[PDB]
RNA sequence: AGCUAGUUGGUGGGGUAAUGGCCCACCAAGGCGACGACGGGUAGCCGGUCUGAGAGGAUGGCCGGCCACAGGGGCACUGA
RNA sequence: GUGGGAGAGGGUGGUGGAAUUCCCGGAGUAGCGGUGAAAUGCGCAGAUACCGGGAGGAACGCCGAUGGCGAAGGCAGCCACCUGGUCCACCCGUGACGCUGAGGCGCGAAAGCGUGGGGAGCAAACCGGAUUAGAUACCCGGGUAGUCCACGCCCUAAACGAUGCGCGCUAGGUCUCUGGGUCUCCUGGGGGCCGAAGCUAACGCGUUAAGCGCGCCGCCUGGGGAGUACGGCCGCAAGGC
RNA sequence: CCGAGGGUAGGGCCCGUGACUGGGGCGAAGUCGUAACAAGGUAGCUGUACCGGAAGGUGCGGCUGGAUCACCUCCUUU
RNA sequence: UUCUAG
RNA sequence: GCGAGCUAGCCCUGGCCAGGGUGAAGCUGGGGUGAGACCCAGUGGAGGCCCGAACCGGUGGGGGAUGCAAACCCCUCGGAU
RNA sequence: CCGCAGUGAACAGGCUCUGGCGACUGUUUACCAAAAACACAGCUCUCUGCGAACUCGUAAGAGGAGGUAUAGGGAGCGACG
RNA sequence: GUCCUAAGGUAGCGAAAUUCCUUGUCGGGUAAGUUCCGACCUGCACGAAAAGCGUAACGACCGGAGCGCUGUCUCGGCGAG
């Protein structure tokens, strides 16, 4: 509902409890609000599975329980995740219900390696964090739009083409 | 998987009289959960194609001696259908 | 490879020598089929006839029985 | 029933080296690689070979076998999870509960298609090099779809033992595996080989029958056109019945 | 009311039938090539896929109705 | 590599 | 310098589509198999979906040409959650 | 029972057979042209790892996008087969 | 058999809205048909990506034909405002 909200931990000892499937329209992200200790929520991210029945959390420790979330070098090797800490501390650093995430594929040094979900490769640095578990995402791709136009629905930009055009009007155009 | 002393429960269970190791009691209830625990198993592993083959031989083994009892006694068929619950 | 509206049965009833959905009313819907129904192709069916070691193949014009048609298509009369 | 036993039957997850090709560093030359002999090709921007490191699929050497499992196709590095079939011994339990099976219903090589990953190597197509008369093929150097997996679709084939299933009767010698026994051998299953009776037109089958008998099945019935045309069912189509 | 017949329309089963075109069979014999039986010269056949004046070829799978010792590993036994 | 039919 | 009370857009915030028709997901029940596939029947009510007012339009013909008008009148037509 | 007529008047598809292009509802050249023109749902190459890449901008800055490679921009075709 | 080129048009299609010689030649439709529609195909100059062959439904798109029906027409002739 036209609105955006959490991304990005870094206040733990925190009792992560997933909240709730709360699947969400806005991100291609599908995610369920986290019921912290306190009672301070977050509608958190989508990395699939951990059930309704929260159970989770992160911490500068560790507990590579699915989904969940630490610094870099709190992290295994072999490892896919999402959460992608970038620079230290910049919250998430891709992978939006980009499903197929990064997989520390080797780390060094104060530079951990990363599997380029995208489609490439390099490293991170040090404390730098990022959340394993899965995406979220069904796919989240297909689906008809069939005797109509899904797209104009779209909300999301008929900003319609052209590039045969009758001028010579727009930029690289 | 199937256990020995659940086995037992289950012949002691079935048996009319105390001995009844093999008779049309005991092989139907031997059969049918067989086939409850092998198609249980069936649903995940979606592709086990072998022993999906060897249940229905299986299932058809079920049924003939299911056959027996009706055409001699339909009587204690009607007590061993409703007691297990099959055919709808 | 599905077939069916008089179609399957019933109540009453017309008509007929009188049975019968045979024709009609009203009622409920069933009746059929691979143990080949519906459709298509073709046809006079038999006693007998020709052949055959035979079982079985063919065939059934004149003599005989039952049957059909009277140029094609129907209907009624008189009337046992 | 019970009590053992074997196996690459299956399918889910997981790990294990061996090497393969690409990538970063070391070292270190001038040639490599390749055939019937060459050539195309790589390489002085330093290749091939060796050292070390990496990443990645994909198979799975020796054991491994003329051996094993399985309904058919077909199935092999170890791991555990569900699970099928199938075999000796006790002779305990039911009590003829059976044997065949139109159609169906399910499986089911490999090619292929549908979408979604992945692509080390192999490899039609296509590309060069050779070749001869000619080279659209053999031979050499490249390389794509596929081959890989999940999921759904095709179901065809020298799908082979070219030979339905069941039980029961008719000498044997011999190799091997599995299960039991008084375990110099007898026993029940299973696999290879020789060989009496017998069948055969011919080879050859021969208690693993192509012998002798009983059920129930499918298929035959001159060669091409044909396994095709036409009608019908089925597939996204290539086709397929 | 039922109905012989006549009409307009709608489909179904079939015979004829056509420019043209796919193939199939004959026919003295024609051209171009070697596919096939001796490893027919690359052993052949096959499901399939692509490609090639045409026989065919190459790939994935396989069946031998494939066979020699022109070579290796050994096997199996007195 | 090829060389008809009787 | 001057302008989106022209018009093309874009942001924010309200209003508006008389009636009718077609009948997919679903859920209920029944249906030969192990569960099912899956069938059917009921319910059900989607779709830039159909038939059409207002409303949006302005092909196809008619008039008009110092018009009613610097684009309008007439018959006609498309769209119609 | 009645008239030539019984939606009695009034509002209310002519249908069919075929071909070509573009699939389709559309959108557009206000005052000629609504079309085989753009638009598309859909495909393919593709630049980009963020403080993105391209667009405005004299330097800030906004956009992008509080998006983050099932994503954002560049594109030639424009179901599906 | 060759001379040149980087190879030197492949599958589908074809007088198509790319074919002027042309109302091309054969076929059907007709009392005759230079429009159509099928087929050949010597494609004056199609062709796979500004896709290529086809394609149910879909179109105020364009072109071809049949019934149904009417002053559109065989000259109309009357009338109402």
Not at chain 1, 146 to 156: C, D, F, Y
Not at chain 2, 65 to 83: C, G, V
Request: charged share 30%; aromatic share 4%.
């Amino acid at each position: 509902q036209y609105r955006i909200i959490d991304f990005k931990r870094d206040k733990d000892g925190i009792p992560g409890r997933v909240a709730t499937i709360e699947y969400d329209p806005n991100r291609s992200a599908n995610i369920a609000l986290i019921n912290y200790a306190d009672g301070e929520k977050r509608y958190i991210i989508a990395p699939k599975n951990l059930k309704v029945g929260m159970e989770i959390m992160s911490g500068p420790d560790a507990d590579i329980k699915i989904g969940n979330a630490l610094p870099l070098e709190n992290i295994p090797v072999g490892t896919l995740v999402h959460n992608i800490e970038l620079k230290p501390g910049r919250g998430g650093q891709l992978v939006r219900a980009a499903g197929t995430s990064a997989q520390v594929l080797g780390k060094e040094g104060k530079y951990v390696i990363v599997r380029l979900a995208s489609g490439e490769v390099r490293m991170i640095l040090g404390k730098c964090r990022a959340t394993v578990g899965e995406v979220g995402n069904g796919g989240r791709t297909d689906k008809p739009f069939v005797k109509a136009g899904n797209k104009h629905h779209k909300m999301k930009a008929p900003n319609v083409r052209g590039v045969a055009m009758n001028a010579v009007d727009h930029p690289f155009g | 998987p199937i256990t020995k002393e659940e086995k037992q429960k289950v012949i002691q269970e079935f048996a009319r009289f105390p001995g009844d190791t093999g008779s049309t009691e005991v092989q139907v209830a031997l059969l049918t959960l067989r086939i409850n625990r092998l198609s249980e198993h069936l649903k995940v592993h979606k592709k086990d194609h072998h022993s999906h083959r060897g249940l229905l031989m299986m299932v058809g083994q079920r049924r003939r001696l299911l056959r027996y009892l009706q055409r001699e006694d339909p009587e204690r068929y009607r007590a061993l259908i409703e007691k297990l619950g099959i055919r709808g």
